[model samples]
Target chain A: QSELEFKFAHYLINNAVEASFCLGDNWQFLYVNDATCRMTEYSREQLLSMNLQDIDVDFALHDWEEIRQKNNYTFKTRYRSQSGRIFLVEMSLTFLEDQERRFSCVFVREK
Target chain B: QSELEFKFAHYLINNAVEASFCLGDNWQFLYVNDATCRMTEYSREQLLSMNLQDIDVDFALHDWEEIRQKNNYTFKTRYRSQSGRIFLVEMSLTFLEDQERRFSCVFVREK
Candidate 1:
């Protein structure tokens, strides 16, 4: 016997070949999928405990507000993987907010 | 007053830079988004009334079953756009079924 439990949005991103993550205040990774783990060479637990600034080689502490000014944005950046391999990546972040929550849904592809 | 009419899965795919569509038996288009229109140079109306065979240059009539045999698959192929521009593209298809319905969720990116 088989049954299914599906959350369509989560399923789509989780199964995507490209890495996807959700970042909350202080750029803390609130969610990540297997692709994200593979891309950064980090275990899921390792990533969830870290913030974007930890892996993004050039990310600035004050840039979060600037990024939130746009509902969605895409840019190229460098990421420092767990093995210390630096790689170029393209990232798209979509900022979403509600009365009590604000976060960015992110998609990343290495170039 | 502005309210949201949101299908989260639809919103994500509709906003994606890659093209996405859903195809049912006979390869008829059940859904498409703006990015699909932009990629194929077809109006929403035109695409909705068309089938995958109309755009996929190398698709064979008997390949549907072969493709569905894999729950998820990705491959490269050529597409003929509305303006007759032939372009190379990478496609991923996910086959899902319930008792009453079967369809492939497709994602396309020009390579």
Candidate 2:
């Protein structure tokens, strides 16, 4: 209800193991972490400037829309490393009160 | 080849996460660990004196035989704890050239 929801959102982000992102209408990467950089083979600055699809060719655009529509909280799937090694990761998404504000978090574990 | 295989066998036992066993012809337990004690709800002494079949009714006698026949190296499966919680575990088996000696090592992770 209040813009202060960003603080609660940030708290949850700290607790998560995966990378977190703040998204705009265009699904621009608003924020990410060292863990995200390691997982996606992108520099933190590069990730913030790029859209989600820019990182993974297989990540479908409609999938992001479905996630946004449901306020999807959790996801699990296999992901590839920069070196092409495969690993399993889980992601969580949360919405902030700032109308158009959304945050995504990811947790990764070795396969 | 040599009796020193038991030392290598012992080294592997120390590295495993689940219980380890040194079995005789009767599948007697020669050693186990604190982690195994927590997983199986058996005390160190209680586990050592009992045969493998005494611990879990579902552990078929023939499963042990199959492992022995192949000189099996590694295995993975679901196992139930004493409290009935299910977990996934990986196991490695090695035979000691010392007469009738075999050792089993298990690594456990929560499901």
Question: Candidate 1: misplaced stretches above 4 Å?
Answer: A1-12, A21-60, A70-90, A96-103, B1-6
Residue A57 displacement (Å), model 1: 10
Clashing pairs in 1: none
Give per-residue lDDT, candidate 1, residue A51: 93
Each candidate's fnat? 0.02, 0.00
lDDT of 2 by residue, B1-111 (tens): 122222222322332333544545666765554566777777767876877666544567347667777764666656665577656666555554333433433333333
The residue-by-residue lDDT of candidate 1 on A72-111, one tens digit each, is 8888889999999999999998877645657677889898
Model 1 residue A60 lDDT score: 74
| Model 2 misplaced regions, further than 4 Å | A1-111, B1-18, B61-63, B99-111
Candidate closest to the true structure, highest DockQ? 1
| Complex DockQ per candidate | 0.12, 0.01
Q: TM-score, chain A, per candidate?
A: 0.86, 0.59
Models 1 onward score TM values of 0.62, 0.36
